[PDB]
Design a protein around this ligand. Structure first.
Ligand SMILES: Cc1cc2nc3c(=O)[nH]c(=O)nc-3n(C[C@H](O)[C@H](O)[C@H](O)COP(=O)(O)OP(=O)(O)OC[C@H]3O[C@@H](n4cnc5c(N)ncnc54)[C@H](O)[C@@H]3O)c2cc1C
Ligand code: HEM
Length: 577
């Protein structure tokens, strides 16, 4: 039994969500009060993502003899941080199912997070050599933009994109990019539109002239990036389509739901002459993404699942899932199990869960809710109406992270590219995977040999007048109506249209597809186009309040969709108990 080698429809896979939806959609209740208590623990963690695993880890650190149960509803631990695997040419090729890398860790990681890393044997400086930073640039490859015929009249791939991004693994001087005039000069847009885009870079103007800096900042917080471009910069509706999907990957929303002020902070163009006031290499990437963080914690917590120690041997270590949930062992991780009930009683907490359609009741002195926060009201019976409602307002964003095994990457080499941005297509981000050597694992190097592609699909509804919560809920409705066959068609259609001109043939050249469907992906985050900062902060703090011996974690609890928020919220929750 070995989930990482599965391909096909993954992420929140069939079997992971149905009991949860019986609660959330049908309002079915699954009470276990009339069942005997089957097992007893010092701590029961609901949810086996990075946050829940960290909670078990910091709790044992404080209580070394503690008996800990971790209940997780997917068929594998890690939550968004999942290991994907392909077999190709007698070797393993690794991919990340979701949680991608550690974000600017020297700048952003707390002392507690850094302590977790060090105890697990993660040396951040090791990625300076593990990440092969000059591999694709040294091969003369650049990033490209793919314009689709539906939106721009013709399919066109334009390379040499100089656009700097938030979390960039390419040193700025190794972009193999062209000037703005030459690059935009190739856009399939009217001469007028191309000249206006070029001028956006060559000759910025104070599009808000006459406002104080403060009024500019007020206006930009209340105005979408798309509207800023349309109404103040004066770009045409055809021009701004170029920008529509740029924010999809890092914020799970298009330019219509991105506050102009957030676009400024993320390095988007148009602000240089506004008079507004005033980088870490994005290389902290295990070959299976932050799934390595989850695996490192699982192995540290449950030594029987795999041998070794440290960041090197984790990469190819063989996990034996039969050792995760062994009786009498102090730490047990129970997969395929949906918690349905959490109730304070007699100085402890009773937790009911459903596994293979059967209800169960266990008991712990302490409980950490490390699951999706909007799930918590359906489980935690003691919530006041106020706090349950607060939890329910963390409306997470759906995303789809697709891994594609290719027979070779000659087509990419021919086209001179290692990454594509598509302004309006379902997949806005498509790239050859990061080249990382770690432990015994070596990144694919030969374009005649197989390689993994990473591509992100976000089911936004651009330009419709929806607030962010509604685009998220509607995006999940669209994902719920998509079969795996429809998902694969979209992958194959777009890969063929982008790579076909250089000899790509999707039926011949794709040898693997793994679709990680994160219907409940990024935590909600406060959006100044729709939310008030003080109200939202009050909701956040209320939602995560301690309930008896039940503490609440998940990255959701910080309204902050980051692995280090997952850790910090677990630490706060463990300290509360
Ligand atoms: C596509 C994608 C890419 C990302 N990339 C990055 C990145 O590069 N860097 C970064 O820092 N962050 C990234 N993230 C953010 C990611 O959310 C965090 O990194 C981290 O994985 C979140 O951990 P968590 O424990 O808070 O939540 P999760 O990983 O979602 O874990 C919560 C778990 O609880 C489970 N659960 C829910 N209800 C129940 C129930 N009733 N019973 C039992 N279990 C239940 C859920 O199924 C889930 O498995 C990314 C997220 C996505 C979706
Ligand atoms: C294939 C995966 C999934 C799809 C397509 C999906 C889709 C949806 C949709 C369309 C909604 C209604 C809109 C909303 O309230 O956000 C929803 C809500 C909900 N989802 Fe899922 N979902 C999936 C997986 C999961 C998983 C893995 C969990 C938890 C373990 C979950 C728990 C919930 C809950 C509890 C609600 C109710 C939200 C509330 O009432 O606040 N879903 N989901």
């Amino acid at each position: 039994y070995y989930p990482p080698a599965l391909t096909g429809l993954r992420g929140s896979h069939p079997g992971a969500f149905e009991v949860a939806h019986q609660m959330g959609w049908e309002k079915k209740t699954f009470d276990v009060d009339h069942l005997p208590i089957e097992e007893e623990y010092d701590l029961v963690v609901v949810g086996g993502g990075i946050s829940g695993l960290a909670a078990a880890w910091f709790y044992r650190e404080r209580h070394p003899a503690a008996r800990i149960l971790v209940i997780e509803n997917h068929d594998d631990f890690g939550g968004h941080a999942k290991r994907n695997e392909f077999q190709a040419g007698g070797r393993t090729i690794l991919g990340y199912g979701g949680s991608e890398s550690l974000q600017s860790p020297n700048a952003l990681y707390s002392e507690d997070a850094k302590h977790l890393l060090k105890r697990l044997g993660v040396e951040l400086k090791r990625f300076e050599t593990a990440f092969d930073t000059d591999f694709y640039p040294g091969l003369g490859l650049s990033r490209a933009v793919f314009f689709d015929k539906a939106s721009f009249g013709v399919d066109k791939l334009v390379s040499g994109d100089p656009t700097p991004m938030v979390a960039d693994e390419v040193p700025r001087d190794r972009l193999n990019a062209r000037s703005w005039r030459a690059f935009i000069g190739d856009f399939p847009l009217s001469r007028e539109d191309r000249e206006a885009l070029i001028a956006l870079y060559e000759s910025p103007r104070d599009y808000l002239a006459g406002k104080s800096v403060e009024e500019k900042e007020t206006y930009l917080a209340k105005t979408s990036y798309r509207d800023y471009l349309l109404k103040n910069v004066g770009l045409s509706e055809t021009s701004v389509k170029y920008f529509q999907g740029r924010s999809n990957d890092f914020s799970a929303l298009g330019a219509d739901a991105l506050p102009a002020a957030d676009a400024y902070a993320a390095g988007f163009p148009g602000f240089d002459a506004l008079g507004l006031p005033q980088d870490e290499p994005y290389i902290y990437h295990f070959p299976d993404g932050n799934a390595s963080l989850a695996r490192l914690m699982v192995r540290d917590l449950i030594p029987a699942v795999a041998p070794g120690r440290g960041m090197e041997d984790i990469v190819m270590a063989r996990f034996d899932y039969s050792k995760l949930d062994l009786a009498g062992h102090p730490v047990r991780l129970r997969l395929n199990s949906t918690a349905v009930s959490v109730r304070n009683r007699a100085g402890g907490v009773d937790v009911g869960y459903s596994r293979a359609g059967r209800l169960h009741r266990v008991r712990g002195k302490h409980c950490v809710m490390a699951c999706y926060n909007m799930m918590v009201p359906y489980l935690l019976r003691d919530l006041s109406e106020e706090q349950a409602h607060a939890l329910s307002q963390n409306v997470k964003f759906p995303l789809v992270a697709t891994k594609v095994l290719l027979r070779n990457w000659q087509a990419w080499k021919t086209l001179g590219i290692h990454e594509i941005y598509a302004p309006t297509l379902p997949y806005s981000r498509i790239k050859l995977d990061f080249p990382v050597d770690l432990g015994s694992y070596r990144h694919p190097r030969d374009p005649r040999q197989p390689i993994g592609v990473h591509m992100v699909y976000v089911p936004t509804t651009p330009n419709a007048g929806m607030d962010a919560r509604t685009q998220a809920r509607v995006g999940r409705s669209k994902l719920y109506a998509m079969s795996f066959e429809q998902l694969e068609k979209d992958i194959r259609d777009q890969l063929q249209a982008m790579l076909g001109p250089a000899g790509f043939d999707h039926r011949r050249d794709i040898t693997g597809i793994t679709v990680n469907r994160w219907s409940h992906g990024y935590s909600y985050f406060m959006n100044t186009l729709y939310d008030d900062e003080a109200e939202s902060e009050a909701l956040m703090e209320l939602a995560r309040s301690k309930v008896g011996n039940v503490a609440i974690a998940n990255s959701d609890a910080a309204w902050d969709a980051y692995a280090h928020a997952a850790i910090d919220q677990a630490v706060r929750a463990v300290r509360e108990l």
